[PDB]
């Protein structure tokens with residue numbers, strides 16, 4: 001056709017909900033209804049700000065610590081969802097490592113990115129809103145709360161990243 | 169189980185006393201994780217002030233660099249932990265240490281908009297003329313970001 005394809009990379013520690021987010025975006029359901037070797041789509045056509053486009057998701061889940069393949073995912077991608085879980089302090093810490101690694105592989109101080117705090121449907125978070133807001137503000141990137149379970153903020157997270165790509 | 173590994177765990181958790189005890193038993197104060205973060209990097213990023221103090225008092229390498237070339241001062245300055253910045257500088261932190269993108273603590277503080285940290289870094293010898301890998305200074309960051317009070321602070 002001619003419509004723009006955006007390659008969106010999902011990074012973050014093991015178990016933050018990277019594949020849950022990917023599946024909720026493309027297949028419109030949570031882990032409990034996800035059937036692998038049936039649901040194999042990694043692309044979704046969408047309308048963001050009146051302009052139709054194609055999202056191609058590059059999920060790092062399962063290759064987080066495979067440096068070679070993780071860096072190849074990054075080099076291939078144009079924008080990054082940096083996902084942590086609001087109930088895992090170590091996952092928040094790891095955001096800093098992934099952001100730095102993205103900057104090195106892409107070779108720019110300004111790469112399109114969004115900070116995502118996943119699992120926000122859960123009460124009694126251990127990484128609060130303020131702390132995550134301050135880190136995003138320190139990074140100069142948007143912060144979006146998501147729940148792959150309830151769909152809260154899921155489109156917002158992926159769409160906001162496309163908007164970041166469009167204005168770089 | 170390595171004592172250094174125990175210290176990293178304790179330092180992340182902000183467990184003041186457990187940190188002292190591992191140090192009393194001969195834990196490597198400069199032990200690093202898979203990213204090159206030491207107990208000092210952790211304490212600096214998480215804002216655990218007293219742990220920064222006791223680590224430095226008991227011979228922690230104030231300028232330890234991780235695999236991205238970042239020191240504890242880079243971390244404290246970006247995240248905005250002023251008192252930790254002050255303490256690291258007091259132990260001779262290299263105020264102009266360059267990471268593997270060429271970024272100094274001043275670049276990171278400028279990018280983050282932590283104005284008092286920027287001023288403290290300048291008072292302690294930070295070089296506004298320091299260029300990152302792309303030829304940009306902290307002043308250029310302030311101009312690009314449209315941060316006028318920051319620009320004024322850096323121009324002096």
Ligand SMILES: Nc1nc2c(ncn2[C@@H]2O[C@H](COP(=O)(O)OP(=O)(O)O)[C@@H](O)[C@H]2O)c(=O)[nH]1
Pocket residue numbers: 013014015016017018019020021031061062118119120121122146147148149150
């Ligand atoms: N309650 C809740 N659980 C989630 C959410 N996202 C992921 N999970 C759960 O967290 C675990 C990790 O999810 P997964 O997608 O495997 O994480 P990955 O390793 O980053 O791909 C699974 O047990 C999911 O059911 C969420 O938004 N809310």
